[PDB]
Amino acid sequence: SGSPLAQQIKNILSLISQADAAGRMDEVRTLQLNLCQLMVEYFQQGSPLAQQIKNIHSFGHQAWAAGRLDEVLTIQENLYQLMKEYFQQS
Ligand SMILES: [Zn+2]
Hints:
By secondary structure, this protein is mainly alpha-helical. It is 82% helix and 0% strand.
């Protein structure tokens, strides 16, 4: 974890919000791929909130691998809300 990584996570969270509002569906997909990688790197190796971000991210991968879109989507809602809290990015 680190401050430049934290700001890049905040940048990508902000662009996801902007791209979503503007209807840029392909860019949203790319942004979510970037956020995924940044989360793996930032949370490598914490507070209860950080532990739950890590757990929920892991279960998100398991749901995605099975194509379980219904569970992916509500995992995403939970994960992204916790990320917005941890990184103070509304
Ligand atoms: Zn991921």
